[PDB]
Structure formats: structure tokens, C-alpha cells
RNA sequence: GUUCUUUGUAAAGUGCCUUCGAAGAGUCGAGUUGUUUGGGAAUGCAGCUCUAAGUGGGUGGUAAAUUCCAUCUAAAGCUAA
RNA sequence: GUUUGACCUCAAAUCAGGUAGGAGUACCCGCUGAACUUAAGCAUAUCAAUAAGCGGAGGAAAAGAAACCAACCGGGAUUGCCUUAGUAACGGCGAGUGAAGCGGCAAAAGCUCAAAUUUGAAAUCUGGUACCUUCGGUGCCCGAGUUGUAAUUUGGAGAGGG
């Protein structure tokens, strides 16, 4: 009950108590997030839009 | 800045200033690269050191 | 030239119809630009001369271009580099005295 | 004069059959992952170097920029369509140039590129562009 | 009694004081020594009074101007701006293109190698230049803490004459005055 | 910009200007601590040539290293002074990743280097697609594993015939010369 | 396979004429000491001394000098199987 | 103005938020580095750039898109297998030591900066705070930054103008 009350008190806050944060692994918590890992440069994004990998086949 | 210059000079005593000249001459030495003769001297000195007896044996023989 | 179609001699080798590949600009790697020349001339004017360059100038004046080139080769390690340095100092002397 | 007086190391390939199975599994997995594309890119025909081997042709790394331009496409698009491009190879042999250009023309006429937004027509997967476009000794 | 002569100052104070002594006591090459000759009090005040009319846009002012453009979006919306140019690479480019009408160079730049070539470049390009005391004072002109350089390329019609008089004044007080000494050690 | 001028002038290292600057600066460096944080790059052109950016998360440390002759043991040489400088700075700031380093100065006792470091925890680095490669755990202590430019040069990592006489080259040749490769159907 | 705003004179590719075309320094390289590989000239690496150029520079280790030729483009960086 | 400030440099805080250390270590990357042994018993040499010692990583590591190999009608990042070949070469009457390019195959993948005036608009970014559809978004604000953060270009090119 008390932990859930603290969780609802902190809901949506940027900084949570460390015991309320997810444990996972030290290395997993040090890894880049999906957003940071997915960041690309403007030049690379333009190239990806202009020349994506195509779907083709060998028949005719 | 006679006042400041003499203050720093007397602090050091506690053309160019003395502190600067001494600092510069501590590190303005000449690194002449080693010569073949000196290197051979080094090698033979190491050989002489490594071909010494131990003190137990030396002192025992000397006492005898 | 044109291969003679036989396995020995001058210009030996098989004969196939030639093509001239487009000249790659990486082969234009040491070329000079007008702005690069401008920058190097200005920096030369600002910075002046290294001491060994000064004594190369003195040697060129007094003891001869042969001895200047020999001293330059001693301080550079390469005969072509000594030639380049001596020609550069000669141009500097001509521009700094005559024109 | 002098003998080898020490003890060697031993590498034993007990995993030869297991590794064959693993390579076969990996190829099938990659085929499923990239279907209906082939497992290999189109490679050019190239003369082997040196006087011992220059009598025959083999597969090269990738088509020259000049050959791609002659075939009528750009390097970026060809790379996305399944063609190997090699920027460091140069052409000085019109026979090899013509063979590679014809190779690219035939590959373009033999592949079907699907629209990047439209509905995909049914098309089976062919695994080997190499088998469908074999290198031929001139 | 006053012990400042015998106060054991911190190491950082001692080092900066010794650096000040060393700079004046050493024999300085002329290309560096030219930065010890700057604009005098009166002409520097006049120069800064001119440039403070062309102090560039602040962030709040940019929001207001982009507000007006957005109204007129859905050339004409905003007028042609007049402001001083201040980036080092930008001003070197302006000098090399001779677009700059007057260049102000801070005397206190560390490393000094960043501006030690600018007077020679401005001479080879014909651009009027002046060495002034204070990268901080230059930065005040462009909303920064410090600025290595500042420049005027375009001025308003009501200020062309003031700019020309300022250039002539700097020529008389700064070029003819320091020409002999800036070439000596 | 000013790049061409800076590069040419800093190449002209025996001129009066650069000798004067070198003298004053080397005295000041001897005044400061053996390893200390530099406020800004002494050679901005060289730093950004080696990958420095003027943004939060980029750090410059200046480090003083004793020369081959001038050691204090409280002749054989295989250890690089620049490598020693980089490793000592990395140990001093182990929260950071060492990117590159460059020579700034020297006297008869010491050489002086400036080490470029990146903060892998800073969001300005983690959201930069051009630099967050250094946030990956595989790049911890590059200078300790010999993966900097000086490390690769000392290891002899280069293409061609001239680069088989290294430690790695000799290890590979030893296992070539005396590894039995026994196949199931013996060859 | 369905649905949502279509993005948009924003972004990118291909054609011709012309002007350019920035490309990393106490580094490259040289000498010497140690070490490593070599039968050897010689080679790699580190210390020390000296230290470039821009139609340049590296490499093509039989002795050195010279002239050509061929081939790449260092002294910054990432990258699956 | 004997004042009041702008900066620079250097500090401090149980300041706000983070991060490093230790373990394991078969495999991987650096440093450091023997001797026994074998060669007439050997100082060259070999063992061996091995054992021991120190440091640093990952699920692989390292290497990697040529300042390459070649000398051909030329090939074309790196890695690994087969190979080259037990060959050329050396030394020995037949004891021994010993390459590399090419070739076949497994796998295949390419790219990023620095160097440019956005100068009709630092277009870039950390943080605090408030809300939201919370691996993040938006507004406001304190800042970083012109001693250069974005866009544009990377030699295979590419940029400016038409």
C-alpha cells in the first residue's frame, strides 16, 4: 500500500526513487535508449528516403 | 611595476627575472642521443653486475 | 603503346581494344589552388624564416649553391627535398633583392 | 642444422558436419528474412591478373561506375536494386566493358522490381543470381 | 602594517602576476607586439558609439519578427537588416572577399594565433582595420560574453559619412602613428 | 575561414612568433599541475581536425610526460609517450572516453600533450548520431586497449607487405608454422 | 489485409555550358641507439637528434646515383557476417 | 570614478543530475617479459615476442572499405578455410629448416569527419519548470555556443553560377 501510494505521488515525474525504478542490469541501464539508438543524421535520413532497399525478384 | 617585480623577486629569494631563468635552465638541457660506445659500456656493466657472487659466499671466503 | 600479341620482347602482351578511363580527382591530390597559394604567401610574410633557412640563405650567398644544397640535404634527409628547399630560397633571394 | 624441439598445437575439425548444417540453416534463415530477394548480388566478369591466370575470367567484386552508367542507372539505385558496385576498379578493356554492360542489361530485363507502395504481385524467390547469370569463358 | 608584499598568495594569483611581468619583460616579436598598440580613448569611444547603433538582433526581437513574417507569409514581410558581423571565420571570409568596410580586432585573444594574421590580411586586402582593447567589449556589441572580431560591411545612409570619418580618423591616429613601431621587436 | 592560416602558421614551428609563444606557454605549463584541465583547446584547428566540437560533452586535458632519457626510477624502448599521456588522462577521468590527442609543446625534460575526451553520459552526445558510437560499451578505455591513432600506429595496424613484422604478425606466423590442422579425413 | 493528414512548388536523382575544386605537421621523411624479421642490402616499432612539400606525397626492400613508368592518397573516424 | 561594472582564469558547496572502481576471465586487445630446453658442451641463436606479472573489453573481440596487391588482357575493404607448398630457397649425401602474391571457397556492406560566408537573420544543443498521447513531445525560462553549434561537401567526388 505505501509503495503504491508513493508511486501514484510520483506518477509522470522525470525523477523517481531508485527503488521504484526498474532494476534490469547495470549494463542494460547504461545502454542507449531506443530513441538515442535510432537517431540518424539529416544527410543519412535524406539518403534513406531517396534510396531505400528495394524489394525485387528474379523472374522477368 | 617596480613594486610588483621586487615583491615577486623577494618572494623568490624567500634581463629576465631570476625565477624565470632558473626554471628555464632546469629544462633547457641537451639530449644528445646515445652512442654505440656508451651502449656497449652499458651492456658490459650489466654483465659485470650479473656476474657477481652472493654476499654469503663472498664474506665466507674472505673470512677464510 | 600497342601490344604486339606475343609473349616476349618489347611491348609484349595480349592485344585488346583500348579504353581510356576517366581521370580520378584523387590523382589530383597535391595540386595547388589560388587561395592556398595566397594563404601560404601571407603566412610566409608573417612568420619569416627558420634559422636553418637563414643559414641556407647565407651559404647561397657566400659558399655556393652546391654547398647550400649539401647542407640542406644534411638537414632534410632527402636530395629532392634539398633541391626543393634550395630552389625556394633562390626564388626568395631573387624576389627579396632584384624584384 | 637445427631441429624443432618443442610441442605443436592441434586444431581438430570435429564440427565439420555441424558447421555445414549451421551454414545451411543460416542460408535458409536469411532467405526467409529477405524473401523474395536472392541471397547474392550480381557480380561482374573480370580477367584474373598475372600471366599464369590471365587466360580465364572469374567473378569480380562489383560493376564499375562507367559500366553502371552505360547500363543506364546510378550507383545508389543499383546498390538498392541488387547490383554490386566497385568504385576502385577501372576499365581499360572494351571486351570486359561490353560484357559487363550486356550483363547488366540482361539482369535488368530479367528482374522485376516491386513498387515501393503498391500491392505486390506474387513472385517466387530465386536464391542464386549467380546461377541465373553464370560467368562464361569468352 | 600592510603585508601585501609578504602575503603568500595562491598559486593561481602568483602565476598570473608572473605572466604579466614576463610579457612586458621579454623581447616580443613585432607581429605580436603590434597588438600592444590600440585605439585611443576618444576614437574608441566614437567607434563603439557608431557600432552600438548596429548591434544585432536579440532572441526576443527575432521572435517578434518571425511573428510578423508568419502573418505575411500566408522580401516584403521584413526589411533589409543592418548589423555588425562578428564570427572569426565569417569576418576572414568577408575580408578575403573585400566586403568588409571596417574591422575591429580584440587585443586580448588566447590563443593569440587566432588573430595574429588578421592585420596582415587586412593590409593585403585594403580593408580598414583597428585593434581595440577588449574581446569582452566587442562581445557586448554582438550579445556574447567575448568576441574575437567585429566588422561593418554595410551601413545606413545616415551613417555612411560617420563611417568614412571614423575610417579617416583611425587612419590618422592608428596607421600613421603605429606603422613604424609595429614592425619592430 | 581561419583554418588555412592556422594550419600553415602552426606548421612554421621555428619562426620567432612560434618560438616566443612556445617558450612562454611551456613555462606556464610547468607552473601548472602535471595533469590539469584545459579551459579551451590551445590549437582549435588541430582539435577539430581530430574530432573535437565546441559543445557540452567535449573536454580537453593537458598532460606532461617525461622523456625517454629523463626518467625517474625512484636501453630498451617500446612504449610511446603519447600513449602514456592518454592512458594517464583516461585513468584520471574514467567517466569519459578518450577520443584523440595531439602534441602541443616540449622541453628537455617533458613533452606536452592535449587529450580530447567525450562524455558518453551527456545527452548532447547520446542524441548526436555522429558521436554516440562512443557511448557503446565496446569502446571503454580505447587508449588502454591500443585503439587510438597512436595505439594503432604502435601496433603496426596497416595494409600491405611492410606490416607482418609486428607482435600480432609474429603470433600469426608462429601459429602458421606450428599448428597442426587435422581434418576428419586427413589431408 | 483496413483506416487516419496527404505531404508538396519541402526533399532527392538524372541532361548540357561555364568558374572552381578547400583534402589532416614535431607529422612524412632522415640519422642514430634498442628491439623485431631476415642470408643480406634492408624492414617494422619505440626513445633521442634533425625535420619537409603541393603539377605534392607514399610505395614498387639486389647494391648506389639518375631519368622514366606503374600504382595508391598517409599523418582523423565508424562499421554486420 | 579612491566608484561601479563587462570579461578571463582559478576555486567552493552533504549544491542539481550522473558516472568510475570490484568480480569473472575459456575465447579477445594492449603493456611487460624469462629460463629450463635445443644447437659440441655456447657468450650469437633457439625455446619465444611463449609461461609468470600488469592493464582493458564483448557476445564475440580485433580488423576493415587501400598512402593495397601487382607488373596481368590486371585485380579491388576486412576476416576465415583449402591452398600456394613442403614449393622457391638454405643446410646437409637424403639429418633437417622453410615463404608470399596469385587460385578455389565461406561470408559479403558500406560509410563519417576536418578543410566553405546561414550572414536577409545559431537556422544548433544541455538543463530547470508546467502540461501531454512519457524509451519521448510541446510552451516558458536559466544557460552553452561565434575562439563556431546546425544544414551543405568527403575525393568514387563535389561546390558556385547558367
Curated annotation (Swiss-Prot), chain A:
GO terms for cellular component: cytosol; cytosolic large ribosomal subunit; preribosome, large subunit precursor. It is found in: Cytoplasm. Its main location: cytoplasm. The keyword Ribosomal protein applies. The keyword Ribonucleoprotein applies. GO terms for biological process: cytoplasmic translation; maturation of LSU-rRNA from tricistronic rRNA transcript (SSU-rRNA, 5.8S rRNA, LSU-rRNA). Keywords: Cytoplasm, Phosphoprotein, Ribonucleoprotein, Ribosomal protein. GO terms for molecular function: mRNA binding; structural constituent of ribosome. Component of the large ribosomal subunit (LSU). Mature yeast ribosomes consist of a small (40S) and a large (60S) subunit. The 40S small subunit contains 1 molecule of ribosomal RNA (18S rRNA) and 33 different proteins (encoded by 57 genes). The large 60S subunit contains 3 rRNA molecules (25S, 5.8S and 5S rRNA) and 46 different proteins (encoded by 81 genes). uL29 is associated with the polypeptide exit tunnel. There are 2 genes for uL29 in yeast. Belongs to the universal ribosomal protein uL29 family. This is Large ribosomal subunit protein uL29A. The gene is RPL35A. The chain holds residues 61 to 120 of 120 of the full protein.
From Swiss-Prot, chain D:
It is found in: Cytoplasm. Keywords: Cytoplasm, Phosphoprotein, Ribonucleoprotein, Ribosomal protein. It comes from the Eukaryota. The modification Phosphothreonine is found at residue 132. The keyword ATP-binding does not apply. GO terms for cellular component: cytosol; cytosolic large ribosomal subunit. One of its GO terms (biological process) is cytoplasmic translation. GO terms for molecular function: RNA binding; structural constituent of ribosome. Component of the large ribosomal subunit (LSU). Mature yeast ribosomes consist of a small (40S) and a large (60S) subunit. The 40S small subunit contains 1 molecule of ribosomal RNA (18S rRNA) and 33 different proteins (encoded by 57 genes). The large 60S subunit contains 3 rRNA molecules (25S, 5.8S and 5S rRNA) and 46 different proteins (encoded by 81 genes). Component of the ribosome, a large ribonucleoprotein complex responsible for the synthesis of proteins in the cell. The small ribosomal subunit (SSU) binds messenger RNAs (mRNAs) and translates the encoded message by selecting cognate aminoacyl-transfer RNA (tRNA) molecules. The large subunit (LSU) contains the ribosomal catalytic site termed the peptidyl transferase center (PTC), which catalyzes the formation of peptide bonds, thereby polymerizing the amino acids delivered by tRNAs into a polypeptide chain. Belongs to the eukaryotic ribosomal protein eL13 family. Present with 133000 molecules/cell in log phase SD medium. This is Large ribosomal subunit protein eL13A. The chain holds residues 13 to 150 of 199 of the full protein.
Swiss-Prot record, chain E:
Transmembrane segments: none annotated. Its main location: cytoplasm. Keywords: Cytoplasm, Ribonucleoprotein, Ribosomal protein. GO terms for molecular function: RNA binding; structural constituent of ribosome. GO terms for biological process: cytoplasmic translation; maturation of LSU-rRNA. It is found in: Cytoplasm. One of its GO terms (cellular component) is cytosolic large ribosomal subunit. The keyword Cytoplasm applies. Belongs to the eukaryotic ribosomal protein eL8 family. Component of the large ribosomal subunit (LSU). Mature yeast ribosomes consist of a small (40S) and a large (60S) subunit. The 40S small subunit contains 1 molecule of ribosomal RNA (18S rRNA) and 33 different proteins (encoded by 57 genes). The large 60S subunit contains 3 rRNA molecules (25S, 5.8S and 5S rRNA) and 46 different proteins (encoded by 81 genes). Component of the ribosome, a large ribonucleoprotein complex responsible for the synthesis of proteins in the cell. The small ribosomal subunit (SSU) binds messenger RNAs (mRNAs) and translates the encoded message by selecting cognate aminoacyl-transfer RNA (tRNA) molecules. The large subunit (LSU) contains the ribosomal catalytic site termed the peptidyl transferase center (PTC), which catalyzes the formation of peptide bonds, thereby polymerizing the amino acids delivered by tRNAs into a polypeptide chain. Present with 238000 molecules/cell in log phase SD medium. This is Large ribosomal subunit protein eL8A. The chain holds residues 44 to 233 of 256 of the full protein.
Swiss-Prot record, chain F:
One of its GO terms (molecular function) is RNA binding. Component of the ribosome, a large ribonucleoprotein complex responsible for the synthesis of proteins in the cell. The small ribosomal subunit (SSU) binds messenger RNAs (mRNAs) and translates the encoded message by selecting cognate aminoacyl-transfer RNA (tRNA) molecules. The large subunit (LSU) contains the ribosomal catalytic site termed the peptidyl transferase center (PTC), which catalyzes the formation of peptide bonds, thereby polymerizing the amino acids delivered by tRNAs into a polypeptide chain. SMART domains: Ribosomal_L15e. GO terms for cellular component: cytosol; cytosolic large ribosomal subunit. Keywords: Cytoplasm, Ribonucleoprotein, Ribosomal protein. It comes from Saccharomyces cerevisiae (strain ATCC 204508 / S288c). The lineage of its organism: Eukaryota, Fungi, Dikarya, Ascomycota, Saccharomycotina. It is found in: Cytoplasm. This is Large ribosomal subunit protein eL15A. There are 2 genes for eL15 in yeast. Component of the large ribosomal subunit (LSU). Mature yeast ribosomes consist of a small (40S) and a large (60S) subunit. The 40S small subunit contains 1 molecule of ribosomal RNA (18S rRNA) and 33 different proteins (encoded by 57 genes). The large 60S subunit contains 3 rRNA molecules (25S, 5.8S and 5S rRNA) and 46 different proteins (encoded by 81 genes). Residues 152-168 have a biased composition (Basic residues). Residues 147-168 are annotated as: Disordered. Belongs to the eukaryotic ribosomal protein eL15 family.
Amino acid at each position: 500500500q505505501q509503495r503504491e501510494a508513493v508511486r501514484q505521488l510520483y506518477k509522470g515525474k522525470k525523477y523517481q526513487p531508485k527503488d521504484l525504478r526498474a532494476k534490469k542490469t547495470r549494463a542494460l541501464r547504461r545502454a542507449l535508449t531506443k530513441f538515442e539508438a535510432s537517431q540518424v543524421t539529416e544527410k543519412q535520413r535524406k539518403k534513406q528516403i531517396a534510396f531505400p532497399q528495394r524489394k525485387y525478384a528474379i523472374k522477368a | 611595476a617596480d613594486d610588483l617585480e621586487s615583491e615577486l623577486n623577494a618572494m623568490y629569494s624567500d634581463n629576465l627575472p631570476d625565477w624565470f631563468l632558473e626554471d628555464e635552465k632546469e629544462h633547457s638541457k641537451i639530449n644528445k642521443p646515445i652512442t654505440k660506445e656508451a651502449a656497449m659500456a652499458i651492456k658490459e656493466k650489466i654483465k659485470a653486475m650479473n656476474a657477481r657472487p652472493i654476499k654469503k659466499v663472498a664474506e665466507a671466503k674472505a673470512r677464510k | 603503346t600497342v601490344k604486339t600479341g606475343i609473349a616476349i620482347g618489347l611491348n609484349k602482351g595480349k592485344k585488346v581494344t583500348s579504353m581510356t578511363p576517366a581521370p580520378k580527382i584523387s590523382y589530383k591530390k597535391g595540386a595547388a589552388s589560388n587561395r592556398t597559394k595566397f594563404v601560404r604567401s601571407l603566412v610566409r610574410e608573417i612568420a619569416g624564416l627558420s634559422p636553418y633557412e637563414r643559414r641556407l640563405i647565407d651559404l647561397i650567398r657566400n659558399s655556393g649553391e652546391k654547398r647550400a644544397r649539401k647542407v640542406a640535404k644534411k638537414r632534410l634527409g632527402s636530395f629532392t627535398r634539398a633541391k626543393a628547399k634550395v630552389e625556394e630560397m633562390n626564388n626568395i633571394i631573387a624576389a627579396s633583392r632584384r624584384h | 642444422h637445427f631441429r624443432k624441439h618443442w610441442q605443436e598445437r592441434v586444431k581438430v575439425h570435429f564440427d565439420q558436419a555441424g558447421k555445414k548444417v549451421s551454414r545451411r540453416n543460416a542460408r535458409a534463415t536469411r532467405a526467409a528474412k529477405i524473401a523474395p530477394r536472392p541471397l547474392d548480388l550480381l557480380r561482374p566478369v573480370v580477367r584474373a591478373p598475372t600471366v599464369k591466370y590471365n587466360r580465364k575470367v572469374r567473378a569480380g567484386r562489383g560493376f564499375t561506375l562507367a559500366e553502371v552508367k552505360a547500363a543506364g542507372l546510378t550507383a545508389a539505385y543499383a546498390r538498392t536494386i541488387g547490383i554490386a558496385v566497385d568504385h576502385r576498379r577501372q576499365n581499360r578493356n572494351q571486351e570486359i566493358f561490353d560484357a559487363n554492360v550486356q550483363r547488366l542489361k540482361e539482369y535488368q530485363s530479367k528482374i522485376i522490381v516491386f513498387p515501393r507502395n503498391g500491392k505486390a504481385p506474387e513472385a517466387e524467390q530465386v536464391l542464386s543470381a549467380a546461377a541465373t547469370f553464370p560467368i562464361a569463358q569468352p | 602594517r600592510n603585508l601585501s608584499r609578504y602575503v603568500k598568495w595562491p598559486e593561481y594569483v602568483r602565476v598570473q602576476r608572473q605572466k604579466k611581468i614576463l610579457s612586458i619583460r621579454l623581447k616580443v616579436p613585432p607581429t605580436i607586439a603590434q597588438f600592444q598598440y590600440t585605439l585611443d580613448r576618444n576614437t574608441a569611444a566614437e567607434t563603439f558609439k557608431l557600432f552600438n547603433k548596429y548591434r544585432p538582433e536579440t532572441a526576443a526581437e527575432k521572435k517578434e519578427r518571425l511573428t510578423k513574417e508568419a502573418a505575411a507569409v500566408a522580401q516584403d514581410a521584413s526589411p533589409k537588416p543592418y548589423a555588425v558581423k562578428y564570427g572569426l571565420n565569417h569576418v576572414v571570409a568577408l575580408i578575403e572577399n573585400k566586403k568588409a568596410k571596417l574591422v575591429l580586432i580584440a587585443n586580448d585573444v588566447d590563443p593569440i594565433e587566432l588573430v595574429v594574421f588578421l592585420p596582415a590580411l587586412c593590409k593585403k586586402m585594403g580593408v580598414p582595420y583597428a585593434i581595440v582593447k577588449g574581446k569582452a567589449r566587442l562581445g557586448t556589441l554582438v550579445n556574447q560574453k567575448t568576441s574575437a572580431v567585429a566588422a561593418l560591411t554595410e551601413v545606413r545612409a545616415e551613417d555612411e559619412a560617420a563611417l568614412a570619418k571614423l575610417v579617416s580618423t583611425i587612419d590618422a591616429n592608428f596607421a600613421d602613428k603605429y606603422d613604424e613601431v609595429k614592425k619592430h621587436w | 575561414g581561419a583554418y588555412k592560416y592556422l594550419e600553415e602558421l602552426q606548421r612554421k614551428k621555428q619562426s620567432d612568433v612560434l618560438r616566443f609563444l612556445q617558450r612562454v606557454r611551456v613555462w606556464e605549463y610547468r607552473q601548472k599541475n602535471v595533469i590539469h584541465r584545459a579551459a579551451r583547446p590551445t590549437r582549435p584547428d588541430k582539435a577539430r581536425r581530430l574530432g573535437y566540437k565546441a559543445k557540452q560533452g567535449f573536454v580537453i586535458y593537458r598532460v606532461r610526460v617525461r622523456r625517454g632519457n629523463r626518467k625517474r626510477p625512484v636501453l630498451k624502448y617500446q612504449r610511446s609517450l603519447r600513449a602514456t599521456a592518454e592512458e594517464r588522462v583516461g585513468r584520471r577521468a574514467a567517466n569519459l572516453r578518450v577520443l584523440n590527442s595531439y602534441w602541443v609543446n616540449q622541453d628537455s625534460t617533458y613533452k606536452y600533450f592535449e587529450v580530447i575526451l567525450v562524455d558518453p553520459q551527456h545527452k548532447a552526445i547520446r542524441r548526436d548520431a555522429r558521436y554516440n558510437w562512443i557511448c557503446d560499451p565496446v569502446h571503454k578505455h580505447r587508449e588502454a586497449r591500443g585503439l587510438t591513432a597512436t595505439g594503432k600506429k604502435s601496433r603496426g595496424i596497416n595494409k600491405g607487405h611492410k606490416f607482418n613484422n609486428t607482435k600480432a604478425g609474429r603470433r600469426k606466423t608462429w601459429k602458421r608454422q606450428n599448428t597442426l590442422s587435422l581434418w576428419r579425413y586427413r589431408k
